[PDB]
Protein backbone atom coordinates (compact mmCIF):
# COMPACT_ATOMS: atom_id res chain seq x y z
CA UNK A 1 0.00 0.00 0.00
CA UNK A 2 1.82 3.18 -1.12
CA UNK A 3 -0.24 5.48 1.12
CA UNK A 4 1.73 7.22 3.89
CA UNK A 5 -0.82 7.26 6.70
CA UNK A 6 -0.14 9.45 9.73
CA UNK A 7 -1.44 8.42 13.15
CA UNK A 8 -3.90 10.79 14.85
CA UNK A 9 -4.92 9.66 18.33
CA UNK A 10 -7.99 11.49 19.68
CA UNK A 11 -9.35 10.57 23.10
CA UNK A 12 -13.04 9.85 23.54
CA UNK A 13 -13.21 9.91 27.25
CA UNK A 14 -10.35 8.58 29.46
CA UNK A 15 -7.76 5.93 28.58
CA UNK A 16 -9.62 5.30 25.33
CA UNK A 17 -7.99 6.73 22.21
CA UNK A 18 -9.34 6.44 18.67
CA UNK A 19 -6.62 6.01 16.04
CA UNK A 20 -7.82 7.91 12.99
CA UNK A 21 -6.14 8.14 9.63
CA UNK A 22 -4.16 11.37 9.74
CA UNK A 23 -3.24 13.44 6.70
CA UNK A 24 -1.69 11.63 3.73
CA UNK A 25 1.90 12.40 2.70
CA UNK A 26 2.65 11.98 -0.99
CA UNK A 27 0.49 11.61 -4.07
CA UNK A 28 -2.43 9.20 -3.71
CA UNK A 29 -1.59 5.77 -5.12
CA UNK A 30 -3.92 2.79 -5.39
CA UNK A 31 -2.89 -0.43 -3.66
CA UNK A 32 -1.66 -3.22 -5.92
CA UNK A 33 -0.72 -6.89 -6.31
CA UNK A 34 2.05 -8.30 -8.49
CA UNK A 35 1.86 -11.76 -10.06
CA UNK A 36 4.59 -13.14 -12.29
CA UNK A 37 2.64 -13.54 -15.54
CA UNK A 38 5.13 -16.20 -16.64
CA UNK A 39 4.74 -18.16 -13.40
CA UNK A 40 0.96 -17.77 -13.45
CA UNK A 41 0.32 -19.07 -16.97
CA UNK A 42 1.75 -22.52 -16.20
CA UNK A 43 0.05 -22.94 -12.82
CA UNK A 44 -3.30 -22.24 -14.47
CA UNK A 45 -2.40 -24.77 -17.17
CA UNK A 46 -1.49 -27.70 -14.94
CA UNK A 47 -4.92 -27.43 -13.31
CA UNK A 48 -6.87 -27.72 -16.56
CA UNK A 49 -4.71 -30.77 -17.33
CA UNK A 50 -5.66 -32.41 -14.03
CA UNK A 51 -9.25 -31.20 -14.44
CA UNK A 52 -9.33 -32.76 -17.92
CA UNK A 53 -9.45 -36.30 -16.52
Amino acid at each position, epitope marked *: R*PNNNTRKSIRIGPGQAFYATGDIIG*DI*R*QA*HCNVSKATWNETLGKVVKQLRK
Partner: antibody
Framework: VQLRESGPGLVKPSETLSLSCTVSQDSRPSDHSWTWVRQSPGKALEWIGDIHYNGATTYNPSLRSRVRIELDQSIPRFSLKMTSMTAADTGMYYC???????????????????????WGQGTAVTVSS | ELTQPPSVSVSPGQTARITCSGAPLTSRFTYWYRQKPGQAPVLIISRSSQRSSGWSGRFSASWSGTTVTLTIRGVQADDEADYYCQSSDTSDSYKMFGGGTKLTVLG
Protein backbone atom coordinates in the same frame (compact mmCIF):
# COMPACT_ATOMS: atom_id res chain seq x y z
CA VAL B 1 16.99 17.34 -25.50
CA GLN B 2 16.70 18.80 -29.00
CA LEU B 3 14.63 17.90 -32.04
CA ARG B 4 13.95 19.35 -35.49
CA GLU B 5 11.28 18.69 -38.09
CA SER B 6 12.04 17.19 -41.49
CA GLY B 7 10.32 16.72 -44.83
CA PRO B 8 8.93 18.50 -47.89
CA GLY B 9 7.03 21.72 -47.32
CA LEU B 10 4.60 22.26 -50.21
CA VAL B 11 1.72 20.27 -51.65
CA LYS B 12 -0.66 20.36 -54.57
CA PRO B 13 -4.30 20.56 -53.39
CA SER B 14 -4.81 16.84 -53.97
CA GLU B 15 -2.80 13.89 -52.64
CA THR B 16 -1.11 13.38 -49.26
CA LEU B 17 1.84 14.91 -47.39
CA SER B 18 4.60 13.34 -45.29
CA LEU B 19 6.35 15.17 -42.45
CA SER B 20 8.89 13.59 -40.09
CA CYS B 21 10.34 14.80 -36.78
CA THR B 22 13.72 13.51 -35.60
CA VAL B 23 14.58 13.61 -31.90
CA SER B 24 18.02 12.96 -30.41
CA GLN B 25 19.92 13.30 -27.11
CA ASP B 26 16.76 12.22 -25.26
CA SER B 27 17.70 10.26 -22.15
CA ARG B 28 14.49 8.18 -22.25
CA PRO B 29 12.13 8.72 -25.22
CA SER B 30 10.23 5.43 -24.87
CA ASP B 31 7.75 6.49 -22.18
CA HIS B 32 7.39 10.04 -23.50
CA SER B 33 4.52 10.53 -25.96
CA TRP B 34 4.61 12.75 -29.04
CA THR B 35 2.18 14.88 -31.02
CA TRP B 36 1.79 17.34 -33.90
CA VAL B 37 0.06 20.73 -34.03
CA ARG B 38 -0.68 23.45 -36.58
CA GLN B 39 -1.19 27.22 -36.74
CA SER B 40 -3.53 28.43 -39.48
CA PRO B 41 -2.55 31.65 -41.30
CA GLY B 42 -5.32 33.42 -39.36
CA LYS B 43 -3.36 32.82 -36.15
CA ALA B 44 -5.55 30.01 -34.80
CA LEU B 45 -3.61 27.18 -33.16
CA GLU B 46 -4.97 23.63 -33.11
CA TRP B 47 -4.06 20.07 -32.14
CA ILE B 48 -3.37 16.82 -34.00
CA GLY B 49 -3.06 13.17 -32.86
CA ASP B 50 -1.31 11.60 -29.87
CA ILE B 51 1.28 8.88 -30.50
CA HIS B 52 3.31 6.79 -28.04
CA TYR B 53 5.92 4.04 -28.10
CA ASN B 54 3.33 1.49 -26.99
CA GLY B 55 1.39 1.80 -30.26
CA ALA B 56 -1.55 4.03 -29.31
CA THR B 57 -2.96 6.35 -31.99
CA THR B 58 -5.84 8.81 -31.62
CA TYR B 59 -6.19 12.00 -33.64
CA ASN B 60 -8.54 14.97 -33.72
CA PRO B 61 -12.04 13.75 -34.65
CA SER B 62 -12.47 16.79 -36.90
CA LEU B 63 -9.42 15.52 -38.83
CA ARG B 64 -9.52 11.71 -38.42
CA SER B 65 -10.65 11.25 -42.03
CA ARG B 66 -7.22 12.31 -43.31
CA VAL B 67 -4.60 12.00 -40.58
CA ARG B 68 -2.84 8.69 -39.93
CA ILE B 69 0.20 8.84 -37.65
CA GLU B 70 2.91 6.19 -37.42
CA LEU B 71 5.92 5.67 -35.15
CA ASP B 72 9.16 4.12 -36.37
CA GLN B 73 10.41 1.34 -34.12
CA SER B 74 14.20 1.16 -34.55
CA ILE B 75 15.01 4.82 -33.76
CA PRO B 76 12.94 7.82 -32.62
CA ARG B 77 11.67 9.66 -35.73
CA PHE B 78 7.86 9.64 -36.08
CA SER B 79 5.87 10.80 -39.10
CA LEU B 80 2.48 12.35 -39.89
CA LYS B 81 0.21 11.78 -42.89
CA MET B 82 -2.75 13.86 -44.09
CA THR B 83 -5.00 12.55 -46.86
CA SER B 84 -7.78 14.39 -48.72
CA MET B 85 -8.42 17.58 -46.73
CA THR B 86 -5.36 19.79 -47.25
CA ALA B 87 -6.42 23.15 -48.75
CA ALA B 88 -6.47 26.16 -46.39
CA ASP B 89 -5.38 23.79 -43.60
CA THR B 90 -1.86 24.85 -44.53
CA GLY B 91 0.12 27.62 -42.87
CA MET B 92 2.77 26.18 -40.57
CA TYR B 93 3.01 22.95 -38.59
CA TYR B 94 5.00 22.26 -35.41
CA CYS B 95 6.49 19.18 -33.77
CA UNK B 96 6.12 18.95 -29.99
CA UNK B 97 6.65 16.38 -27.24
CA UNK B 98 3.80 15.61 -24.86
CA UNK B 99 5.82 15.31 -21.65
CA UNK B 100 4.62 12.38 -19.55
CA UNK B 101 5.85 12.49 -15.97
CA UNK B 102 4.69 9.40 -14.06
CA UNK B 103 4.28 9.21 -10.29
CA UNK B 104 2.89 5.72 -9.65
CA UNK B 105 2.28 2.46 -11.51
CA UNK B 106 1.55 2.30 -15.23
CA UNK B 107 -1.46 0.40 -16.61
CA UNK B 108 -3.38 1.45 -13.48
CA UNK B 109 -3.86 5.14 -14.28
CA UNK B 110 -1.15 7.09 -12.43
CA UNK B 111 0.53 8.98 -15.28
CA UNK B 112 -0.72 12.56 -15.15
CA UNK B 113 0.31 14.94 -17.90
CA UNK B 114 2.99 17.62 -18.05
CA UNK B 115 2.12 19.06 -21.46
CA UNK B 116 4.40 20.45 -24.13
CA UNK B 117 7.93 21.17 -22.92
CA UNK B 118 10.14 20.98 -26.05
CA TRP B 119 9.01 21.94 -29.56
CA GLY B 120 10.66 21.75 -32.95
CA GLN B 121 12.25 24.52 -34.94
CA GLY B 122 8.83 25.07 -36.52
CA THR B 123 8.40 24.56 -40.26
CA ALA B 124 5.90 26.15 -42.65
CA VAL B 125 3.76 24.59 -45.38
CA THR B 126 1.25 26.11 -47.81
CA VAL B 127 -0.90 24.59 -50.55
CA SER B 128 -1.43 26.71 -53.67
CA SER B 129 -0.45 24.65 -56.77
CA GLU C 1 -14.45 23.55 -28.32
CA LEU C 2 -13.59 25.99 -25.53
CA THR C 3 -13.72 29.75 -25.00
CA GLN C 4 -10.80 32.15 -24.58
CA PRO C 5 -10.70 35.97 -24.68
CA PRO C 6 -8.76 37.10 -27.75
CA SER C 7 -7.85 40.62 -26.66
CA VAL C 8 -7.30 41.94 -23.14
CA SER C 9 -5.08 44.94 -22.36
CA VAL C 10 -3.69 45.91 -18.94
CA SER C 11 -1.24 48.32 -17.36
CA PRO C 12 2.46 47.35 -17.27
CA GLY C 13 3.92 46.41 -13.91
CA GLN C 14 0.41 45.41 -12.76
CA THR C 15 -1.36 42.08 -12.43
CA ALA C 16 -3.38 40.57 -15.28
CA ARG C 17 -6.12 37.99 -15.81
CA ILE C 18 -6.47 35.28 -18.46
CA THR C 19 -9.50 33.00 -18.73
CA CYS C 20 -10.38 29.77 -20.52
CA SER C 21 -13.93 28.46 -20.10
CA GLY C 22 -15.24 24.99 -20.88
CA ALA C 23 -16.94 21.89 -19.54
CA PRO C 24 -14.10 19.29 -19.41
CA LEU C 25 -12.19 21.43 -16.89
CA THR C 26 -12.36 18.44 -14.51
CA SER C 27 -10.36 15.87 -16.51
CA ARG C 28 -6.93 17.41 -17.11
CA PHE C 29 -5.86 20.76 -15.66
CA THR C 30 -5.41 23.72 -18.07
CA TYR C 31 -2.03 24.74 -19.61
CA TRP C 32 -1.57 27.87 -21.75
CA TYR C 33 1.86 28.55 -23.37
CA ARG C 34 2.89 31.82 -25.08
CA GLN C 35 3.50 32.48 -28.78
CA LYS C 36 6.10 35.10 -29.65
CA PRO C 37 6.13 36.35 -33.26
CA GLY C 38 7.95 33.71 -35.29
CA GLN C 39 8.96 31.52 -32.33
CA ALA C 40 7.86 28.23 -30.77
CA PRO C 41 5.69 28.15 -27.63
CA VAL C 42 7.14 27.59 -24.16
CA LEU C 43 5.70 26.09 -20.98
CA ILE C 44 4.01 28.88 -19.04
CA ILE C 45 2.90 26.44 -16.35
CA SER C 46 3.35 22.76 -15.59
CA ARG C 47 2.33 20.03 -13.16
CA SER C 48 4.74 17.86 -11.16
CA SER C 49 2.15 16.42 -8.74
CA GLN C 50 -1.18 17.71 -7.38
CA ARG C 51 -1.12 21.31 -6.06
CA SER C 52 2.58 22.11 -6.63
CA SER C 53 2.14 23.50 -10.14
CA GLY C 54 1.72 27.28 -10.35
CA TRP C 55 3.65 28.20 -7.20
CA SER C 56 6.74 30.35 -7.51
CA GLY C 57 7.95 30.68 -11.09
CA ARG C 58 5.71 33.81 -10.87
CA PHE C 59 2.24 33.58 -12.48
CA SER C 60 0.01 31.37 -10.38
CA ALA C 61 -3.43 30.16 -11.40
CA SER C 62 -6.86 29.69 -9.93
CA TRP C 63 -9.69 27.37 -10.88
CA SER C 64 -13.07 28.73 -9.77
CA GLY C 65 -15.82 26.77 -11.52
CA THR C 66 -16.56 26.62 -15.24
CA THR C 67 -13.69 28.96 -16.16
CA VAL C 68 -10.13 28.99 -14.83
CA THR C 69 -7.88 31.95 -14.07
CA LEU C 70 -4.20 32.63 -14.79
CA THR C 71 -3.42 35.18 -12.09
CA ILE C 72 0.01 36.28 -13.37
CA ARG C 73 2.69 37.97 -11.24
CA GLY C 74 2.90 41.68 -10.45
CA VAL C 75 5.42 42.84 -13.04
CA GLN C 76 4.11 42.67 -16.62
CA ALA C 77 6.89 44.60 -18.38
CA ASP C 78 7.52 43.48 -21.99
CA ASP C 79 6.51 39.83 -21.46
CA GLU C 80 3.86 40.24 -24.18
CA ALA C 81 2.78 37.72 -26.80
CA ASP C 82 -0.21 35.55 -27.73
CA TYR C 83 -1.47 32.99 -25.19
CA TYR C 84 -3.55 29.89 -25.94
CA CYS C 85 -5.00 26.95 -23.92
CA GLN C 86 -4.42 23.19 -24.22
CA SER C 87 -6.16 20.60 -21.93
CA SER C 88 -7.78 17.25 -22.83
CA ASP C 89 -11.30 15.83 -22.79
CA THR C 90 -13.28 13.91 -20.16
CA SER C 91 -12.66 10.63 -22.02
CA ASP C 92 -8.96 11.57 -22.38
CA SER C 93 -9.48 11.10 -26.13
CA TYR C 94 -8.22 14.02 -28.27
CA LYS C 95 -7.36 17.60 -27.27
CA MET C 96 -9.23 20.80 -28.06
CA PHE C 97 -7.61 24.20 -28.52
CA GLY C 98 -9.94 27.18 -28.32
CA GLY C 99 -7.81 30.13 -29.31
CA GLY C 100 -6.53 32.57 -26.76
CA THR C 101 -5.41 36.06 -25.84
CA LYS C 102 -2.94 38.64 -27.11
CA LEU C 103 -2.14 41.16 -24.38
CA THR C 104 -0.48 44.54 -24.92
CA VAL C 105 1.32 46.85 -22.49
CA LEU C 106 0.48 50.56 -22.50
CA GLY C 107 2.82 53.42 -21.66
Amino acid sequence: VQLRESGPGLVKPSETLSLSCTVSQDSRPSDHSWTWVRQSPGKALEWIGDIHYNGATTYNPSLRSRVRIELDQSIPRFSLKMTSMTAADTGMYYCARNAIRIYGVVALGEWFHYGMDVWGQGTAVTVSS
Amino acid sequence: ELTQPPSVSVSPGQTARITCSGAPLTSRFTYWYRQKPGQAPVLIISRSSQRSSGWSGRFSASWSGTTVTLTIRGVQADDEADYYCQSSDTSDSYKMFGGGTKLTVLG
